[PDB]
Design a protein around this ligand. Structure first.
Ligand SMILES: O=C(O)CCC(=O)C(=O)O
Ligand SMILES: O=C(O)CCC(=O)C(=O)O
Ligand SMILES: [Mg+2]
Ligand SMILES: [Mg+2]
Lengths: 314, 314
């Protein structure tokens, strides 16, 4: 069934955006606004990055938000300790691409970090991801995921370089689901270098993924990851009842403006839903249809997301 | 095999962009620049739109470009006459969604318009599309395409409202290929309302499509269609030899600037390849990899497209 949640990573992946320079107060404002919106998880930079990243994690995790606050660390004993001490509700392990590949060792090293966390904070949710998941040799990847999955709440896949294709993502998520079973959750994180972050997230869900990483406006390393708004536009057309129940969709314009303001960008003219142009109609044969029925050339209603259409009649 | 061509529609679909107001000279400049780039087709607004659309079609078709110039008309006898008289090298018929549906009639009406064109201009390439192809009842759609295909050079599919999913596009293109046979070309046109225009174009090609519609920066009705640059980024990662042979890729920045300048927009901060941020790296563990190998977190080389990476070390 198509049930899924969003992990916002504006305060993690989004910090890796070129122009991101979030004050503790910027982060709190973003987190509170995402919580009001209904977002299920808020992921934050590793506490090990700096004394300020640690403090921010500590504060965000203690905000009393309905959303779970989770932090993203390298899969190391070092960083695990720091992470649990911050009070986060979840820890997202990333086993980085080093790595040749000795698999029961990798399995041992992962299970150890995971074991410490269960010991030291049994109520913290643990996710395990290998970096560059879609480009790793698949037998070894599945071998590691299959062995680690009984010990974790979730496994993730990361299209780190933004080159995975929708059918590749669908296929690999299906194989992961087959080896981890129905209980373990499956998270997808995808970069947008080839314009496939939204499509891939969607195919990931169709294949059984339960969690999708987004950032507001898609901010992140390079051209960033799956954007919150474009993702909701995609999901809304397919599950409109579900999506409108889950989230305060009319808040999207303000989330996009807030982050645009803070990182010093303009909202792209063609940005999903909230871009200057998202609902503009011009062709005569289009306009003549919008008068009998606004739906005729509209994928979704603009009022649902708190915006309006423009007609260009001249 | 993965052979395909691009039909640029900046001078057709792109004219339907909210802020598009192209002078005859703007169009000539765009067309010449696309021709230098290596684009195979340039599609232009219907000559029936206004006396100026007719003139522009006439001029563009007579520029002596290597690219074929083709015009997009309603599937009517009226408009066909006007179209051949302009000297275009191709005519792209669109049978609009009216339509209930009486199929041998629709087939008769289409075959007639097509027959006139063969009579009056036997060297003109004819494409047939039904509007809103992915949402039409499939048996009737395939019935019409199958009957019309022996008489045309190409059939197209249009995701008019921008809601088709990548696996739906793949499937329907496969079914169309099955009924039209290996000779007739297959064109895909997709809107970006749900962030799937690039993904869909790519899946269309994997399924056997031979032609993809793009506009520079994706300008078009609403948030527009498959953007030239994001499409090339997608294809380049998969067929780098082929793509770099076909097109002058280092011209992409200037094509994007030219159109941004003319329609009065800024290039999106995260725009594929040419956006301010397309090649910016920040995370410490990313930067430490870019020094040993720039490829480690880069989908494609920036110099290939005439741009540079940015490192954010502080
Ligand atoms: O752990 C993850 O899923 C994401 C880490 C990341 O930014 C990437 O691999 O692209
Ligand atoms: O004829 C076509 O393929 C495209 C016409 C169009 O703009 C659409 O259906 O979205
Ligand atoms: Mg990432
Ligand atoms: Mg269109």
């Amino acid at each position: 069934m198509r049930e899924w949640k969003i992990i916002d990573s504006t305060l993690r992946e989004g910090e890796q955006f070129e122009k991101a320079n979030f004050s503790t107060q910027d982060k709190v404002e973003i987190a509170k606004a995402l919580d009001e919106f209904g977002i299920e998880y808020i992921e934050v930079t590793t506490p090990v990055a700096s004394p300020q990243s640690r403090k921010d994690a500590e504060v965000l995790a203690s905000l009393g938000l309905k959303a779970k606050v989770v932090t993203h660390i390298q899969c190391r004993l070092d960083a695990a300790k720091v992470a649990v001490e911050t009070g986060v509700q979840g820890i997202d392990l990333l086993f980085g691409t080093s790595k040749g590949r000795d698999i029961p060792r990798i399995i041992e090293e992962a299970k150890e970090v995971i074991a410490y966390i269960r010991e030291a904070a049994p109520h913290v949710e643990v996710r395990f991801s290998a970096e560059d998941t879609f480009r790793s040799e698949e037998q070894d990847l599945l071998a590691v995921y299959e062995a680690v999955a009984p010990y974790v709440d979730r496994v993730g896949l990361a299209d780190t370089v933004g080159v995975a294709t929708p059918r590749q993502v669908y296929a690999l998520v299906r194989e992961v689901r087959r080896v981890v079973g129905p209980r373990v959750d499956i998270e997808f994180h995808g970069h947008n270098d080839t314009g496939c972050a939204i499509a891939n997230a969607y195919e990931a869900i169709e294949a059984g993924a339960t969690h999708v990483d987004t950032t507001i406006l898609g901010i992140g390393e390079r051209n960033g990851i799956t954007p919150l708004g474009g993702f909701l536009a995609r999901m809304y057309t397919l599950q409109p009842e579900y999506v409108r129940r889950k989230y305060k969709l009319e808040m999207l314009p303000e989330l996009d403006r807030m982050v645009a303001r803070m990182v010093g960008v303009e909202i792209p003219f063609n940005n999903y839903i909230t871009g200057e142009t998202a609902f503009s109609h011009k062709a005569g044969m289009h306009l003549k249809a919008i008068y009998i029925n606004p739906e005729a050339y509209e994928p979704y209603p603009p009022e649902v997301f708190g915006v309006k259409r423009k007609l260009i009649i001249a």
